[PDB]
Write a protein that binds this ligand. Structure first.
Ligand SMILES: Nc1ncnc2c1ncn2[C@@H]1O[C@H](COP(=O)(O)OP(=O)(O)OP(O)(O)=S)[C@@H](O)[C@H]1O
Ligand SMILES: Nc1ncnc2c1ncn2[C@@H]1O[C@H](COP(=O)(O)OP(=O)(O)OP(O)(O)=S)[C@@H](O)[C@H]1O
Ligand SMILES: Nc1ncnc2c1ncn2[C@@H]1O[C@H](COP(=O)(O)OP(=O)(O)OP(O)(O)=S)[C@@H](O)[C@H]1O
Ligand SMILES: Nc1ncnc2c1ncn2[C@@H]1O[C@H](COP(=O)(O)OP(=O)(O)O)[C@@H](O)[C@H]1O
Ligand SMILES: [Mg+2]
Ligand SMILES: [Mg+2]
Ligand SMILES: [Mg+2]
Lengths: 338, 314, 322, 255, 477
């Protein structure tokens, strides 16, 4: 559904006319394209911009790409593998499957691709999960090979990137789509999908409740179209994912009851949420913002909430067993709210 | 000369002092003979190797030279060894009493490569009718999970104070040494459970200063003096503590790690202050230690540690 | 032609300074002939290596090239090295050797726990045909068994008299003049490591040898060492404690820029200065020490320099309010 | 317990070296009739049996039957020491944990006694029953060894055919193919060049090349090797000895 | 030769296929595959008969250690009357040695199987081979070219080739991706292990408390050999389970006591003694303290500090101790930090919230949750490896956003459209390279109001059968 209405060119883009104009400007120099560092919130379509730029420079056949697996041996006697999706002109490295061996794989793969000889494109996904050693190796690779490897790295909140890397690449940002433009894209979607709308207020409602995240907005429109039989009326009970509802029920249990007898069940809910492929930082952010949204608290309680949330977010980023820090944060929250 | 730790090493199982449960377990094992494969884990110098050696000796009697294969960190333990030599030793015919078995004693099992530990699996599973394996390790986490599960785990707690005191008193009585109670308490302090280190420090004190006295022990240990560190950690005004740490400890070339470790050890034994304040002082000293180990060892860190300890004590 | 660090290396037991308490002991050990396994440990630039090489050359004379084996840290140092090389050298008996060999392990604190266990087992096995000597900077990273197996020797830093005697001997044997405050600043900045002294001396020699007669002032010493002058420290502390925020910020910035000052060493000097003030209250000292230690710990991870500078200024100012 | 005295020490050396490459651990059942041994290959495809009666021993005295299970690499390392003109002697004590091998020189006092540590093996002793083999033949051992060493250089399988009093060996590899045929005949001038043949059913079997290359090493024991082939049963290769026999049971391949 | 001097694991080993406790389904699958391997060979391994288990040549066993994989394989091979040619880690399984030894016996027949019994009509498979490659995961660095040669042995073979490993999803075991069938042995449940332990105990003339048996089965984490070996220690009776077997339970009981941290009790039990109590077992003490530190009625509360503040400070110190443990395990050579960890994770929270135990001491559950998280992360990584070609997201945003609507499109038609929507469902399944196992995995990752394990079976089984038989006809890649 969503992927069926994904643009495949800079002209097919229907958002951020400034950004598409600047990319049309940059695509005028296929012989000299500096390194790019795209940064912006999740679901803004930075990968769409990158693939459209690639389609503008190279042929439109860049979108039919094949997956491949590559296994290599490290300095020690461990032989580990990764999966790269490659195209006739570019390859996408995602140093996320591997835990601490980012530097060796990035070094080896870049040095191997940089001896194929008109250049090649390397798309680095999740450029914030790179250890500083891997980042330094990447910068030295950029320093050595500059005529075959033109790096384009997408990321969000580009604080964990050392200034030695920011200097070489062109910093490009992708602001979230405004509610008006989200509503426009939703209207185009429902028009090309002949969805029977009762009014246009549902589109603005979804744009507002989506918090400027384009892809989750489109996906929740998809999810709601299959619950109203393609006839979206004004009485639409907006559908949230399962984990958001679980986190909101946890927030309501925290607010309504403040005791260890409820902290046990809170730890149980945290265990059940974590064991089903959900990060710790996402749970912490959602729980903090949900607790801040509650209207029964004053300003001092909210200040204590945000301070403890910051402290335990730092501790989560420093630790390894997330359940401990999550239980500690919830215990301190229950203490302050008591 | 001769090291006391080597001269007075227990050869009979009954002479071992320390854990009362596992030594009786091994006593009953030697009494019966049906010994299973066993990993023996615990902190250094608490009687791991001597235990298994005495067990093998008492279990096999006159056939120890022919029915025991020992492998320590010195001998080569790779893939070829575990495949050829251990396998040819397990199959070796040997007529022993009905309950006994050939013994393979692998000391420092942690250094054995995981790939090398793989080969031992079927070799010890198949020939369990005439061969038993005894691993001796410090940390039972570096042993692969199969070997971890095939054998019985035997944990050895660190030595208490009364057991080390009894052993040291036995050694003194056997050696006719002049001593005093404060010297023995200082030995217990500088040992913290290491029977080997306790005996060696005792022998070094006796050889160097003749009489076992507090100042002699604290001059031969080359560690910061516990009394002066206690005075530092218990001074009323902060400037006195800072001056003590500056002039009496920092000038004489002591390593910051040693200062923090001595402060930790003396704060553990301050049986005059309350329990909660002791725990909080230990927390502060440990945070300072963790800061020191991360690469920074400036005097300012120890100064801040003393400042926070005083702030807690106020 | 060779640097002074390699040239002025001692060759006899007499040419070592500030270590008499250990020199008399090693002379007793060499005249007795009962030399056991030794552990030499202490801060760098003290003379452990020089002392042990001189002792070996004295005990074995010309046979030094045969009965003395020197090994260093991490020479492909798996368990295989301790199994082959050290074990062969220890076990193998020479053709015409009387006594015992000597294996000196330099900077041998970088050994893993398994390597140290192999080494302790080896030294336990062949303790009758050879003696070992282990050198270390930190005696807390060694297994207590290996420590207990040998006799310890801590190398206290070189006192002022020893370093002054050594720099005098270097001065009379070279074409250099040294001003009275020069040696004072030298001893204050070196903290007692002879190697750094012998390095900085030839450095400032090659630096200011324009007419072969220039005097080494404290400026060139502070430049070559890269350490601030106490006057600048007093001035910046005065500006922080007296002036307002903007002027103090500009003063700190210019002092740390025009001279190249790191916040770590600046904080070290500032707390050294504040250590001797007559503070009337106590909470000021506690808050000052705590905040400054926090600043140093945060700097240890490389944050934003200007933010840590402003935080230093704020801590120093808000501490002095009683 | 047992005392066995060989006449020539080279005999047992050749016996051991004949099949020391097909079995790593063998069991020697010492009875009063002599020495009997059987051992299965590590892949359970090639069995080896060995019989040596009392006639091959100058003096053989066994108190009661026993089982000496020893290695072959160590036994070959030991047997490689003694010279040819010696008097090998095998001795074992009660409850034998080790066997003693004495090497005595007839005209000297140079006695060299070696000790060997016996191994422990589960006695998976299967009993062999005589079967009426369809094809029974005998041919010079050198001829068979040459034929195997020539054919094995092509593939990993060799096909044997017995049809209308004709022997045939066939090999088909990727580098080519080869075939040899043998006609039975006899010569009064030298009976050591005759190829006997007694066929009851024309048989077609296929065997592995490596196993035949390991078997043909027994050509140093005797000169006339016998072969018994059946339609589906394992083939029997026999080398006769002055007092016994060495037999290789080989398992055929599948179609 | 003696009935007693043998170990308790070898003496009580299973003999039939009804004594193997747990994993009955996988045992039956292996047995039904080995029995029909003959007809699979007759059909040239191209007709997947009724289970999709007719095309594969080699069966692969994997699972946690101490479940019966080796025993199940040997007993399954023996019941059918085969002949077991077994090779394990203790043999040099290099490429050249495998080509020499085993490869030449992939199609040959057995001599011992022939001579053992061939006259009475018991079974016709008395002479065939069943090659068991045990501990293929254990191929160390000294076995070069082993995994690839065994992957090649999976194909082109002529006899049943069973393979045993401990970690299927290890990268080294990748060449076994689709060339062999692979079944999984899960950790057996408490009921079967309890029945087996009861049989053993009554057979050995000694009885135990069922609660102690439950605590044992919990501590050993499902390993049957481990619990049997630990039970054999009873002969050498509260001292046994108090000191040796159930040590972490007693550590937690002693530490959470309220009388120790009191001034009267502290003078008798020093803090050094509590640090030694921790050092008794430094692998399970932190988890045990963290699991049940908030289930006791306290008695050391300060005059003005309620229970919630105490538990909050305890959790704060627990987080600090977790950070310290991570710093320790970052470099083992920093074991000097071990006493500090002792006070942070172990001593401080206990001293803060000590008192009297309300109920019973529950064993730690973080291990099972960690294992479940690892399994679900592996499954999600596989799903992303499949679906990345047409989604343009990361491995974590997938579960966050796409999984709810994917589950809707894949299931909700089965609730309202009945059974004719399969042609549509597979259509969606044909756009994202998903399979039936991928469909199950997608259906699994759901918690809250959208639980699917209850709903899944409500649909008619006829719909499931039709969907399975209709997906078998087409294939997207
Ligand atoms: N309980 C004990 N009673 C008497 N002596 C003991 C005891 N525990 C240790 N020792 C002494 O400590 C010495 C050191 O040997 P072990 O304790 O066997 O060393 P270890 O326990 O194996 O520790 P390692 O080798 O560093 S892992 C022994 O020779 C004994 O003299
Ligand atoms: N006590 C001393 N007396 C005289 N010169 C010394 C003394 N200590 C060091 N030196 C000089 O400084 C040089 C370095 O000495 P080293 O023995 O290498 O120091 P170190 O004790 O080995 O410390 P390291 O190697 O950094 S751990 C020597 O070659 C001498 O020139
Ligand atoms: N289901 C079971 N019921 C009873 N005993 C069992 C069971 N599974 C294993 N055992 C015991 O474990 C012994 C054999 O261990 P296995 O579980 O077969 O080893 P494994 O399954 O190959 O696991 P590894 O080799 O450590 S990876 C048997 O003799 C029994 O004592
Ligand atoms: N200009 C646009 N017009 C229509 N759809 C868009 C546009 N920009 C982004 N999208 C949609 O946003 C979705 C998510 O973008 P994506 O690059 O996957 O975000 P992320 O960077 O989080 O992976 C895409 O599926 C795409 O269809
Ligand atoms: Mg030991
Ligand atoms: Mg040195
Ligand atoms: Mg197994």
């Amino acid at each position: 559904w969503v992927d069926k209405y994904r643009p495949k060119s800079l002209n097919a883009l229907s958002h951020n006319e400034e950004l598409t104009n600047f990319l049309k400007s940059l695509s005028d120099q296929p012989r000299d394209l500096p390194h790019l560092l795209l940064y912006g919130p999740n679901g803004t379509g930075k990968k769409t911009r990158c693939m459209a730029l690639l389609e503008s420079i190279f042929g439109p056949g860049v979108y039919r790409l094949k997956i491949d697996v590559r296994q290599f041996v490290t300095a020690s006697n461990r032989k580990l593998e990764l999966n790269v999706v490659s195209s006739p002109y570019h390859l996408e490295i995602t140093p996320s499957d591997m835990g601490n061996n980012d530097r060796i794989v990035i070094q080896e793969l870049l040095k191997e691709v940089a001896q194929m000889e008109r250049y090649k494109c390397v798309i680095i996904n999740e450029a914030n999960s790179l250890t500083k050693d891997a980042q330094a190796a990447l910068r030295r690779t950029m320093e050595k090979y500059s005529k075959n490897i033109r790096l384009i790295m997408v990321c969000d909140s580009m604080s964990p990137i050392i200034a030695p890397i920011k200097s070489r690449c062109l910093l490009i940002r992708c602001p979230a789509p405004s509610d008006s433009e989200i509503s426009t894209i939703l209207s185009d979607v429902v028009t090309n999908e002949r969805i029977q709308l009762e009014t246009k207020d549902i589109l603005k409602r979804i744009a507002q409740a989506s918090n400027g995240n384009l892809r989750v907005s489109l996906l929740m429109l998809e999810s709601m179209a299959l619950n109203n039989e393609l006839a979206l009326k004004s009485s639409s009970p907006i559908i949230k994912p399962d984990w958001i509802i679980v986190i909101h029920k946890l927030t309501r249990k925290i607010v309504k009851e403040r005791s260890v007898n409820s902290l046990i069940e809170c730890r149980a809910v945290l265990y059940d949420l974590l064991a089903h492929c959900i990060p710790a930082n996402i749970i912490l952010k959602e729980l903090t913002f949900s607790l801040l949204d509650v209207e029964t608290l004053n300003t001092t309680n909210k200040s204590s909430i945000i301070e403890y949330s910051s402290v335990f977010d730092e501790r989560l980023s420093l630790g390894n067993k997330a359940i401990f820090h999550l239980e500690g944060f919830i215990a301190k929250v229950m203490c302050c709210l008591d | 000369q001769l090291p006391w730790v080597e001269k007075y090493r227990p050869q009979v199982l009954s002479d071992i002092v320390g854990n009362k449960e596992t030594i009786d377990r091994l006593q009953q094992i030697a009494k019966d003979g049906n010994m299973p494969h066993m990993i023996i884990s615990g902190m250094p110098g608490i009687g791991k190797t001597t235990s298994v050696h005495c067990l093998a000796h008492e279990l096999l009697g006159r056939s120890y030279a022919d029915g025991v294969l020992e492998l320590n960190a010195s001998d080569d333990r790779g893939i070829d060894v575990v495949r050829n030599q251990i396998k040819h030793f397990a199959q070796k015919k040997l007529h022993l009493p009905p309950g006994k078995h050939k013994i393979v004693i692998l000391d420092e099992a942690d250094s054995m490569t995981a790939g090398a530990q793989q080969a031992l699996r079927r070799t010890m599973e198949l020939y369990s009718n005439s061969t038993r394996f005894a691993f001796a390790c410090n940390q039972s986490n570096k042993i692969i999970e199969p070997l971890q599960s095939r054998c019985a785990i035997l944990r050895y707690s660190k030595l208490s104070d009364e057991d080390v005191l009894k052993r040291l008193l036995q050694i003194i009585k056997l050696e006719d040494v002049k001593y005093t109670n404060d010297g023995l308490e200082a030995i217990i302090f500088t040992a913290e459970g290491d029977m080997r280190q306790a005996i060696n420090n005792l022998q070094s004190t006796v050889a160097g200063h003749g009489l076992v006295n507090a100042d002699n022990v604290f001059k031969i240990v080359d560690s910061p003096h516990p009394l002066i560190v206690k005075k530092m950690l218990l001074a009323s005004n902060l400037e006195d503590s800072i001056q003590i740490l500056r002039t009496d400890l920092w000038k004489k070339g002591y390593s910051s790690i040693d200062i923090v470790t001595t402060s930790f050890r003396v704060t553990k034994n301050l049986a005059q202050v309350k329990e909660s304040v002791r725990l909080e002082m230990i927390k502060e000293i440990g945070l300072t230690h963790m800061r020191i180990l991360e690469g920074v060892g400036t005097y300012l860190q120890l100064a801040s540690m003393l400042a926070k300890i005083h702030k807690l004590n106020n | 032609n060779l640097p002074w660090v390699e040239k002025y290396r001692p060759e006899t037991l007499d040419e070592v300074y500030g270590q008499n308490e250990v020199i008399t002991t090693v002379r007793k050990f060499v005249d007795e002939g009962k030399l056991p396994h030794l552990l030499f440990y202490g801060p760098p630039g003290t003379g452990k290596t020089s002392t042990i090489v001189a002792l070996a050359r004295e005990i074995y004379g010309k046979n030094y090239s045969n009965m003395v084996l020197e090994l260093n840290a991490s020479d492909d140092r798996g368990i295989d090295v301790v199994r082959n090389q050290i074990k062969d050298f220890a076990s193998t008996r020479q053709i015409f050797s009387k006594g015992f060999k000597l294996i000196i392990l330099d900077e041998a604190d970088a050994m893993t726990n398994a390597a140290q266990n192999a080494l302790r087992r080896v030294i336990e096995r062949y303790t009758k045909n050879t003696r070992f000597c282990v050198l270390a900077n930190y005696a807390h990273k060694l297994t207590p068994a290996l420590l207990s197996r040998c006799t310890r020797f801590r190398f206290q830093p070189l006192p002022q008299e020893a370093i002054e005697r050594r720099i005098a001997n270097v001065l009379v044997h070279e074409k250099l003049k040294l001003s009275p405050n020069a040696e004072k600043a030298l001893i204050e900045l070196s903290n007692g490591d002879m190697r750094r002294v012998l390095n900085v001396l030839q450095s400032c020699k090659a630096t200011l040898d324009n007419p072969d007669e220039d005097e080494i002032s404290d400026d060139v010493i502070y430049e070559c060492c890269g350490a601030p002058r106490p006057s600048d420290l007093k001035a910046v502390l005065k500006s922080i404690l007296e002036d307002d925020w903007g002027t103090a910020h500009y003063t700190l910035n210019k002092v740390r820029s025009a001279k190249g000052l790191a916040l770590i060493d600046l904080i070290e000097g500032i707390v050294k200065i504040l250590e001797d003030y007559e503070l009337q209250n106590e909470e000021t000292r506690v808050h000052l020490l705590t905040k400054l230690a926090d600043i140093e710990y945060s700097i240890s991870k490389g944050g934003n320099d200007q933010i840590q500078g402003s935080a230093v200024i704020g801590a120093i100012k808000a501490s002095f309010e009683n | 317990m047992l005392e066995a005295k060989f006449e020539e020490a080279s005999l047992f050396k050749r016996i051991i070296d004949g099949f020391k490459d097909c079995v790593q651990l063998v069991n020697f059942q010492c009875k009063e009739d002599g020495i009997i041994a059987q051992a299965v290959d590590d892949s359970r495809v090639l069995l080896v049996s060995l019989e040596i009666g009392v006639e091959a021993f100058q003096e053989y005295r066994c108190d009661h039957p026993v089982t000496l299970g020893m290695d072959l690499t160590s036994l070959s390392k030991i047997l490689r020491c003694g010279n040819n003109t010696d008097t090998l002697t095998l001795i074992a004590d009660n409850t034998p944990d080790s066997i003693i091998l004495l090497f005595e020189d007839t005209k000297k006092d140079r006695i060299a006694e070696y000790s060997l540590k016996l191994m422990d093996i589960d006695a998976d002793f299967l009993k062999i029953e005589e079967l009426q083999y369809d094809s029974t033949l005998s041919l010079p051992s050198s001829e068979f060894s040459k034929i195997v060493r020539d054919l094995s250089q092509l593939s990993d399988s060799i096909n044997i055919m017995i049809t209308k009093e004709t022997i045939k060996f066939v090999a088909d590899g990727d580098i080519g193919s080869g075939s040899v045929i043998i006609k039975p005949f006899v010569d009064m001038e030298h009976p050591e060049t005759s190829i006997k043949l007694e066929m009851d059913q024309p048989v077609d079997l296929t065997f592995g090349a490596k196993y035949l290359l390991d078997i043909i090493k027994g050509s140093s024991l005797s000169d006339r090797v016998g072969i018994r082939l059946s339609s589906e049963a394992p083939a029997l290769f026999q080398f006769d000895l002055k007092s016994g026999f060495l037999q290789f049971f080989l398992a055929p391949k599948f179609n | 030769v003696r009935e007693e001097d043998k170990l308790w694991t070898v003496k009580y080993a299973p003999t039939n296929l009804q004594q193997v406790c747990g994993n009955k389904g996988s045992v039956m699958k292996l047995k039904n595959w080995l029995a029909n391997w003959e007809n699979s060979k007759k059909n040239s391994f191209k007709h997947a008969g009724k289970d999709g288990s007719g095309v594969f040549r080699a069966a692969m066993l994997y699972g946690p250690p101490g479940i019966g994989k080796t025993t199940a394989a040997h007993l399954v091979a023996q019941e059918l009357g085969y002949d077991i040619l077994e090779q394990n880690a203790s043999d040099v399984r290099s490429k050249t040695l495998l080509n020499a030894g085993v490869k030449n016996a992939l199609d040959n027949m057995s001599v011992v199987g022939y001579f053992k019994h061939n006259e009475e009509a018991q079974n016709l498979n008395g002479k065939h081979f069943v090659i068991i490659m045990d501990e293929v995961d254990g191929m160390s660095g000294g076995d070069r070219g082993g995994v690839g040669q065994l992957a090649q042995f999976c194909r082109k073979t002529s006899t049943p080739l069973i393979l045993i490993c401990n970690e299927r999803n290890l990268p080294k075991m990748r060449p076994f991706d689709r060339v062999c069938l692979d079944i999984q042995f899960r950790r057996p449940d408490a009921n079967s292990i309890k029945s087996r332990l009861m049989t053993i105990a009554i057979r050995e003339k000694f009885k135990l408390d069922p609660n102690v048996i439950d605590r044992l089965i919990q501590t050993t984490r499902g390993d049957i050999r481990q619990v049997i070996n630990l039970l054999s220690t009873i002969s050498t009776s509260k001292a046994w389970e108090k000191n040796i077997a159930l040590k972490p339970f007693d550590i937690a009981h002693k530490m959470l006591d309220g009388q120790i941290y009191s001034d009267i009790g502290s003078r008798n039990f020093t803090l050094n003694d509590k640090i030694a109590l921790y050092f008794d077992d430094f692998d399970f003490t932190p988890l045990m303290i963290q699991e049940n530190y908030l289930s006791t009625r306290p008695s050391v509360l300060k005059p003005g500090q309620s229970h919630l503040e105490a538990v909050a400070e305890a959790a704060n110190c627990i987080s600090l101790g977790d950070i310290v443990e991570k710093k320790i395990r970052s470099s083992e050579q920093l074991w000097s930090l071990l006493p500090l960890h002792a006070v942070l994770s172990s001593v401080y929270p206990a001293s803060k919230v000590a008192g009297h135990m309300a109920g019973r001491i529950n064993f730690t559950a973080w291990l099972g949750q960690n294992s479940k998280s690892a399994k679900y992360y592996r499954l999600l990584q596989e799903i992303h490896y499949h679906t990345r070609l047409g989604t343009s997201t990361d491995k974590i945003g997938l579960r966050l956003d796409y999984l709810p609507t994917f589950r809707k499109r894949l299931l909700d038609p089965f609730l309202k459209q009945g059974a004719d929507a399969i042609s549509s469902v597979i259509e969606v399944m044909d756009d994202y390279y998903l399979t039936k196992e991928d469909w199950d995995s997608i259906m699994e990752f759901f918690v809250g109001p959208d639980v699917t394990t209850a709903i899944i079976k409500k649909i008619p089984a006829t719909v499931k059968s039709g969907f399975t038989r209709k997906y078998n006809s087409m294939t997207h890649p």
